[PDB]
Design an enzyme around this catalytic site. Sequence first.
Site, PDB file in Angstrom:
ATOM      1  N   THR A 266       0.528  -1.276   0.010  1.00 54.07           N
ATOM      2  CA  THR A 266      -0.077  -0.028   0.042  1.00 54.07           C
ATOM      3  C   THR A 266       0.715   1.102   0.082  1.00 54.07           C
ATOM      4  OG1 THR A 266      -0.208   0.043   2.604  1.00 54.07           O
ATOM      5  CG2 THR A 266      -1.930  -1.173   1.276  1.00 54.07           C
ATOM      6  N   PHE A 391      -8.243   5.236   4.467  1.00 54.43           N
ATOM      7  CA  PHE A 391      -7.769   4.652   5.375  1.00 54.43           C
ATOM      8  C   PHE A 391      -8.926   3.710   5.890  1.00 54.43           C
ATOM      9  CE2 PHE A 391      -4.241   7.608   4.882  1.00 54.43           C
ATOM     10  CZ  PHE A 391      -3.407   6.556   4.734  1.00 54.43           C
ATOM     11  N   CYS A 398      -7.368   1.774   9.411  1.00 55.26           N
ATOM     12  CA  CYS A 398      -5.865   1.435   9.237  1.00 55.26           C
ATOM     13  C   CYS A 398      -5.104   1.856  10.460  1.00 55.26           C
ATOM     14  CB  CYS A 398      -5.032   2.027   7.814  1.00 55.26           C
ATOM     15  SG  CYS A 398      -3.301   1.782   7.441  1.00 55.26           S
TER      16      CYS A 398
HETATM   17  C1  HEM Z   1      -0.666   4.293   2.404  1.00 53.87           C
HETATM   18  C2  HEM Z   1      -0.589   3.223   2.840  1.00 53.87           C
HETATM   19  C3  HEM Z   1      -1.919   2.715   3.487  1.00 53.87           C
HETATM   20  C4  HEM Z   1      -3.305   2.431   3.013  1.00 53.87           C
HETATM   21  C5  HEM Z   1      -3.899   3.389   1.903  1.00 53.87           C
HETATM   22  C6  HEM Z   1      -4.050   1.892   4.101  1.00 53.87           C
HETATM   23  C7  HEM Z   1      -5.299   1.427   3.878  1.00 53.87           C
HETATM   24  C8  HEM Z   1      -6.123   0.877   4.850  1.00 53.87           C
HETATM   25  C9  HEM Z   1      -7.402   0.379   4.769  1.00 53.87           C
HETATM   26  C10 HEM Z   1      -8.418   0.953   3.672  1.00 53.87           C
HETATM   27  C11 HEM Z   1      -7.613  -0.672   5.869  1.00 53.87           C
HETATM   28  C12 HEM Z   1      -9.103  -1.233   6.468  1.00 53.87           C
HETATM   29  C13 HEM Z   1      -9.423  -2.423   5.402  1.00 53.87           C
HETATM   30  C14 HEM Z   1     -10.915  -2.810   5.773  1.00 53.87           C
HETATM   31  O1  HEM Z   1     -11.578  -2.125   6.235  1.00 53.87           O
HETATM   32  O2  HEM Z   1     -10.966  -3.928   5.264  1.00 53.87           O
HETATM   33  C15 HEM Z   1      -6.643  -0.571   6.533  1.00 53.87           C
HETATM   34  C16 HEM Z   1      -6.161  -1.606   7.451  1.00 53.87           C
HETATM   35  C17 HEM Z   1      -5.033  -2.137   8.154  1.00 53.87           C
HETATM   36  N1  HEM Z   1      -3.766  -1.401   7.584  1.00 53.87           N
HETATM   37 FE1  HEM Z   1      -3.302  -0.270   6.422  1.00 53.87          FE
HETATM   38  N2  HEM Z   1      -2.951   1.360   5.013  1.00 53.87           N
HETATM   39  C18 HEM Z   1      -1.692   1.521   4.620  1.00 53.87           C
HETATM   40  C19 HEM Z   1      -0.680   1.330   5.307  1.00 53.87           C
HETATM   41  C20 HEM Z   1      -0.404   0.430   6.167  1.00 53.87           C
HETATM   42  C21 HEM Z   1       0.840   0.411   7.156  1.00 53.87           C
HETATM   43  C22 HEM Z   1       2.142   1.007   6.973  1.00 53.87           C
HETATM   44  C23 HEM Z   1       0.175  -0.606   8.121  1.00 53.87           C
HETATM   45  C24 HEM Z   1       1.130  -1.139   9.101  1.00 53.87           C
HETATM   46  C25 HEM Z   1       2.100  -1.777   8.805  1.00 53.87           C
HETATM   47  C26 HEM Z   1      -0.967  -0.953   7.766  1.00 53.87           C
HETATM   48  C27 HEM Z   1      -1.640  -1.731   8.822  1.00 53.87           C
HETATM   49  C28 HEM Z   1      -2.996  -2.064   8.778  1.00 53.87           C
HETATM   50  C29 HEM Z   1      -3.744  -2.950   9.859  1.00 53.87           C
HETATM   51  C30 HEM Z   1      -3.165  -3.744  10.687  1.00 53.87           C
HETATM   52  C31 HEM Z   1      -5.085  -2.855   9.188  1.00 53.87           C
HETATM   53  C32 HEM Z   1      -6.160  -3.494   9.822  1.00 53.87           C
HETATM   54  C33 HEM Z   1      -6.760  -2.720  11.312  1.00 53.87           C
HETATM   55  C34 HEM Z   1      -7.748  -3.340  12.102  1.00 53.87           C
HETATM   56  O3  HEM Z   1      -8.706  -3.855  11.385  1.00 53.87           O
HETATM   57  O4  HEM Z   1      -7.539  -3.445  13.399  1.00 53.87           O
HETATM   58  N3  HEM Z   1      -1.376  -0.134   6.758  1.00 53.87           N
HETATM   59  N4  HEM Z   1      -5.448   0.056   5.978  1.00 53.87           N
END
Ligand code: HEM
Length: 453
Positions: A266, A391, A398
């Site tokens: 991402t 996010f 996220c």
């Molecule tokens: C620009 C980069 C990123 C974007 C656009 C992004 C976007 C998202 C989105 C849209 C979700 C939720 C998906 C859902 O509802 O099914 C999410 C969840 C998550 N992201 Fe990211 N993300 C990014 C970078 C990262 C980074 C660097 C990490 C950490 C290493 C990360 C860790 C997570 C985790 C662990 C979740 C699940 C959270 C939970 O449900 O407790 N992401 N992200």
Amino acid sequence: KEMPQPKTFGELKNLPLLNTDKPVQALMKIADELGEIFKFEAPGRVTRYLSSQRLIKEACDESRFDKNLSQALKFVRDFAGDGLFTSWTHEKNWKKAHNILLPSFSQQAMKGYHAMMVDIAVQLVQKWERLNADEHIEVPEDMTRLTLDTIGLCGFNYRFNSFYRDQPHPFITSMVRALDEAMNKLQRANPDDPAYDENKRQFQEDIKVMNDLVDKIIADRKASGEQSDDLLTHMLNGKDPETGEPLDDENIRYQIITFLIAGHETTSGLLSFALYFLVKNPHVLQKAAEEAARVLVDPVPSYKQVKQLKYVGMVLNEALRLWPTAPAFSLYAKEDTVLGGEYPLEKGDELMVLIPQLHRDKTIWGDDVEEFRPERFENPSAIPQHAFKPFGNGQRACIGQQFALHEATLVLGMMLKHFDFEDHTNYELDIKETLTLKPEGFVVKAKSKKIPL
Ligand code: HEM
Ligand SMILES: O=C(O)[C@H](Cc1ccccc1)NC(=O)[C@@H]1CCCN1C(=O)CCC1CCCCC1
């Protein structure tokens, strides 16, 4: 109202619409034809895709709707297990892992990760400084080298050493190939059909490879006893305030795999799309470049200098608006409910938010919705609720949001400080779809401003 449906293919319903390598973009196009909501059926499944701020704002009501594991996420679960990303909100490991990790991911925690981010970012600058006059940059390839290395280092103090390599670490080839398999399964009307027997055998070998190295990392860290300031120590020591319990070794594995997925897919996309937008909008690139030269006065950027890169931050926001690198998320209805006064949903009923379509809603953004103008983020409070969701939403948003924006801001800042950029091929955007969106074949030339590190 009855909601529209795209074209069907007999007993297969809508499913062959996904039989493409750009399904999100195909879905975006269905949205332009059908509007803010459509039904999408496959054998044994029905979902509804939302594209309007009007409806998505209700779908983001956490008392009516919870995160759903989409078929894609169910397939990623086979290797990401019950890590935060592929767990259900009502799983005990969700909340528990969530309580332990939140302080590791705060804006506060960034100060401590900062120096490791700089370490990888200077590797990137040094690569580019060392290129010969004839040579170009392969943009998403280098951004992925950066972001993967960065999460390796801040995650558990492992160096993937991506800038020393032509081909990816053994872990990544497996990881990438597993994500690949998870997304390709989406299309298969008949799995268990023998033509997929190799795919399955491969997958199992891939899961295996990922598990071994991560389990070995956790093992080696415990056996060593060292307390590095990385996510792995936070996880090995941490106790959930609520249950009082720590995460087990297996869950910790799942968390690490999850962060490696995130860091690969991402954040690299964001940085790729941002640079694309900048070279296609020279007045914008120049404005960002002027900010960078003004703010980044030191050989290497401080944490506080990065917080000062406001226009850079707006650029990242606008790139996320046009091409959210994670393009969709799923929800289910907690109870029977009426969506937007018109569409009655039953308990269990599934929704899909089509983030790029949402970000194109002309009632929110105005008529120039297609134009790259970072200034539209100049005062955020003027933005209606749930308009911008790159996010995700609520408690299931996220957790790495702040990590990703700090990394991106740092890296773009330094890039704009150190080089002028040239769109030497006049690149035509081609968007590759994996778990995420990337600009495939995006290449530039950098020319050094000869500012030393
Ligand atoms: C620009 C980069 C990123 C974007 C656009 C992004 C976007 C998202 C989105 C849209 C979700 C939720 C998906 C859902 O509802 O099914 C999410 C969840 C998550 N992201 Fe990211 N993300 C990014 C970078 C990262 C980074 C660097 C990490 C950490 C290493 C990360 C860790 C997570 C985790 C662990 C979740 C699940 C959270 C939970 O449900 O407790 N992401 N992200
Ligand atoms: O995976 C799903 O359940 C559906 C596709 C679908 C819909 C109906 C029937 C079968 C498959 N997903 C989608 O709409 C889109 C199209 C293909 C990929 N996709 C996604 O869900 C994106 C996958 C993940 C989701 C969370 C954030 C990062 C990206």
